[PDB]
Amino acid sequence: HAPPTLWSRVTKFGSGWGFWVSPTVFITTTHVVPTGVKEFFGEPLSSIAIHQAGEFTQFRFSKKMRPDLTGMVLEEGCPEGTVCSVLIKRDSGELLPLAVRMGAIASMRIQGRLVHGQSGMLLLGTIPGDCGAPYVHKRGNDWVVCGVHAAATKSGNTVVCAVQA
């Protein structure tokens, strides 16, 4: 049961979504970031610390963009066998949380790109435009985010999230 505040962190961005880890840190999948844009959320690129690798992108802003949020833990993937929720938002507004059992972390070549990824098997499917949606799981009392949606095989039952370096 992801609460409304956790859903409110999922944010429309470029050709997909991103996720507010904290009031200043925003993560997404690199390939959804719009490329001829010089401002993100009213901020100029010069005010954003940007870290990117293996299709995982992090922005750190110079000002509290989402002061309503608490900071939560961002992990480099999760343990194999962890069940995670993919907090998918559709453009219609529909909320679609997908349960996924996470497999191994690995380097992957997907449509010509290197992805530092973690595979997962769904337990509905994903579509173009869902990329950047967060992979989250509960750590007892709290929620942990550990990936952003990147790919789903030809089949449909396996998904890939990019994870931090």
Q: Which is nearer to ligand N38, 69 or 108 (CB)?
A: 108
Which residue lies nearest ligand N38, judged by its C-beta? 131
Could you tell me which of 56, 57, 156 has the C-alpha nearest to residue 116?
56
What is the nearest approach in angstroms of ligand N38 to the Cβ of residue 64?
A: 29
Near ligand N38 by CB under 6 A: residue from 72, 105, 160, 161: 160
Which token pair is 140?
A: 């007892």
Is 80 one of the catalytic residues? no
Cα separation, 31 vs 57, whole angstroms: 9
**Is 100 in contact with 121 (CB distance < 8 Å)?**
yes
Q: Residues 106-115, buried b or exposed e (16+ Cβ, 10 A)?
A: eebeeeeeeb
Binding mask 129-148 for ligand N38 (x = CB under 6 A): -xx-----------------
Cα dihedral angle (123, 126, 130, 132), rounded to 10 degrees?
40
When binding is defined by CB under 6 A, the residue of 10, 54, 55, 163 that contacts ligand N38 is 55
The answer to whether residue 31 is catalytic is: yes
76 is catalytic: no
Does 115 interact with ligand N38 (rule: CB under 6 A)?
Answer: yes
Spell out where the chain is interrupted, by the residue before each break (C to N > 2.5 A): 123
Residue 127 binds ligand N38 (CB under 6 A): yes
Q: From its phi and psi, is residue 8 left (phi > 0), alpha (psi between -120 and 50) or beta? A: alpha
- The contact mask relative to ligand N38 for 3-32 (x = CB under 6 A, - = no) is -------------x--------------x-
Residues within the interface to ligand N38 (CB under 6 A): 16, 31, 55, 108, 110-111, 113, 115, 126-128, 130-131, 150-153, 160
Q: Which residues are part of the catalytic machinery? A: 31, 55, 131
